[PDB]
Amino acid sequence: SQAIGILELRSIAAGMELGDAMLKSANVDLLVSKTISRGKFLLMLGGDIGAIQQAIETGTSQAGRLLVDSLVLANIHPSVLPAISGLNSVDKRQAVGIVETRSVAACISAADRAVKGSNVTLVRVHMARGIGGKCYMVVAGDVSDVALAVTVASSSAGAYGRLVYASLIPRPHEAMWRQMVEGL
Amino acid sequence: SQAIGILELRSIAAGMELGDAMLKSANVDLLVSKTISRGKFLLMLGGDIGAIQQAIETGTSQAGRLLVDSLVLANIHPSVLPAISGLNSVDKRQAVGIVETRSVAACISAADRAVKGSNVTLVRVHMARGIGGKCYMVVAGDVSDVALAVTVASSSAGAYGRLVYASLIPRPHEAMWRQMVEGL
Amino acid sequence: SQAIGILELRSIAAGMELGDAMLKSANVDLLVSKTISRGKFLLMLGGDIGAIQQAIETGTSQAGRLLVDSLVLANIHPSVLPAISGLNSVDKRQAVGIVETRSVAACISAADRAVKGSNVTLVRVHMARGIGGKCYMVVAGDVSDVALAVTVASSSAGAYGRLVYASLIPRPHEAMWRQMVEGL
Amino acid sequence: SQAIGILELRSIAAGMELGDAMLKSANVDLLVSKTISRGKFLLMLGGDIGAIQQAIETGTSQAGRLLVDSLVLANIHPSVLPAISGLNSVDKRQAVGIVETRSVAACISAADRAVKGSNVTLVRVHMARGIGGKCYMVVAGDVSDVALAVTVASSSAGAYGRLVYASLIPRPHEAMWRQMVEGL
Amino acid sequence: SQAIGILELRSIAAGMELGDAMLKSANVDLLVSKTISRGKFLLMLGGDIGAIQQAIETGTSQAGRLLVDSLVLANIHPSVLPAISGLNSVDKRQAVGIVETRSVAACISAADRAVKGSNVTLVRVHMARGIGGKCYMVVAGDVSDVALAVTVASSSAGAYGRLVYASLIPRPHEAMWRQMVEGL
């Protein structure tokens, strides 16, 4: 199915010459393109596995030694990709769970295995910064649906030692709701 | 409600003179008592918060230099106590969950935070070797309630970080099952 | 012919979620599964070279950081597999041979190089504690065939140097016998 | 009177070829033989001072580099030998005494200095793990004779300082009792 | 019941200004008042727990930084106190036991638990010097009475790691008698 591509650079200008260059390389779509402290830059792609590799190989080779890190992920549930570049609309307020990971590489793995393993709506996959720091996912649904989403995430991230904490809020406060599902 | 008391001794003989002692001191129940490598000894007690606090107060005051450590845990779901000393009757085979911890202090606190929080039956709590070794609990029930129990147990054990791994098995094999709920 | 697969994990719970997993993954047989001090876990599998390679490929890819080590052994005399998991029926008392090794990887390779090479019946293969601890095999039969088996086992284990000692007992005492072929 | 012989080997297989050997060498009795962590092996023999000295002389000369250590103990109260290999029939429940030592060499010398010195029946001598690990004896009888046995055992073991702790329990609980005189 | 108070100073003159000052502070009684090598001084009190604390608090505060150590013990069998400042008269020559301890604090504990735990006559509690060196007790009575006195002392001192040796002489030589019970 779909794929996630990531390209992290040490120069902000390069990430934009390499941002516009991967858009013309294949039919990939841009999800994240923001500066990271203190000087690094982040690019996140998605789409067909062919387009992604053809786009990530494109940027990596041109980046040369400006490239700080680049990864590509495959077999990603399509409902993960809009959780990266934005949110997903909640159907109705219900139970919530959050899984915090130690590296963004493990964060997408735990969500992919969480949507393909339950019925929750993956709300958003936000990162406090970078590609090696605190990243979290948010999921909502039944008290049971969320309960299964966390355990598969707590396993897929725990099996790689990149897990910080995972909690479940069955009755989330009206305030905390509009912060976990909407961010503010 | 109920309470757990634990006393660890540097001596096997010192544990037994104090073992019979706390039995007479009040109205507690003897839970665990066996050799801990390379020669430490472990005691566990389950009764009322009053009977446990005085019994443990009897042991820590007379253990002296042979006392390695002691701890008191209270407000415990009663079914935690028989899962410590023995097994709980598995009504019918269903889903199985196991949380593995590094500290039995964090194992019981995770086990207590499971039976209060879900409809699973706390099958057993085992300690492979030591009060700082690989302890783990087992819970069984519907795939829904088991996933919740594994998460509330991993939340309480993960906030203390003594969480090693926590997995859920919905469809356990015939060979696997008689080894999780019975041990052998 | 047949094949052996082995997966060692840093976690007891992680071994069991993966244990039930490789059972469903193909057509293998569960050989060994128990706690390894101070808290590692061991898995062994016996089936066909195809079913074992994919099952082990399922486990090493999902064990992650909890994976201590893994290994695949193939082209195995079938009677090695039951000597691993249990005992083989001693027809009549005769001579006894035992080769003791430091690595179970070298123990099975010595055990396989014994039953193919002599008419002895591979009684049992035991692992006192660990995949790097004192493992040993036992073979029985005529004093002639047993001496050959001890030598071909010590040749294959001595070229790897993980050979500790290998002795032959032609006239085993009544007390000795029920301890070598049965263990107790 | 009688005598005890002890031979400790670095190899499990080397212990068994030599085990059957000393059985044929004279008229001794096989007392103990089991795996000692992490892979040492232990042998104990009980017979006559003549049969034990030659049997041990047979083993130390042929053990070579695999020999960890050996020792001969003589002029032993006969009832020490069955307390080493097994248990002694507790006639009726009474007072219980236990002396815990660090060395089995000092444990037997304390146990021998107990049955000669009091009317207690030496219930059992156990070795939790190793010839340098937590060994201990158990004696039973009147509260009078048990206290004397614990003292003469602690005097002989305390002059060697390998004494860990020595306690007396006059009124042992029902749970405590079946664990001291039987072990479980 | 009664109490033991101890005050150890670094100045001999101060221990006598503070010796006469605690006599007028309450109704306490003086037991020991001798110089310790090389310059330290010892004061030992007894009587009601109120008088002792009121006397020991008196000396400690006035001693200031001349105070080397001060302790107070409670629930002391009254028959211990004359064994400190002197001896107790033997009713008839019989069995004897001696318990040597590593600190005077543990020496009074083992005797208190020895008289309150048997029927022996605590003869004397002498110290070779100081409050942190070799101190011993002497007890006499039946062969059984002494046997129980030693084991409770060997436990009360062993549980705190301040025990050196404990022996029992059932038939003490006529000479050694007038040295353990009378000192010379």
Add this chain to the structure above:
Amino acid sequence: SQAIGILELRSIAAGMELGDAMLKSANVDLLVSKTISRGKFLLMLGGDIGAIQQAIETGTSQAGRLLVDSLVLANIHPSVLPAISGLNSVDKRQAVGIVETRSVAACISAADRAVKGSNVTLVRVHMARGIGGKCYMVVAGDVSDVALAVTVASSSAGAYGRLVYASLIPRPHEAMWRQMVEGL
């Protein structure tokens, strides 16, 4: 029965003055007398235990500090001695086994116990150099006879930690034959 005597010197001329001097000292026979790198010299004797000791004591005392090492072995099967100074004639081409040892002292022990323990013909006991380096034996006979010869050798050398490898060639190539039994 017979005996083996060995005398290793640091001077080549001394080993020949001491070579001719032990021939006139008793009725001993000379087996080996060759230079060892880089300057050491080797003398090997045989015959009655009286003659050997009387010859080895003769050379050792005269050698003074030129003596690098000297040993004497007793109860040697007479068929070992011609395997040292030369070969033994093969009756018919059959199975072959070779045992390599880490010190010449263990090499003669494993052969002595090999001829006295089977029916093979000990072909030759050659050393690549010195008395502390790679020495091997060669034996021929049945596939079974050799199989027993190796295991007793692999034990007698393994029990002293001076064993390198031991193999068995049941169908030795026509070429390798004339190299293991004849040397070339």
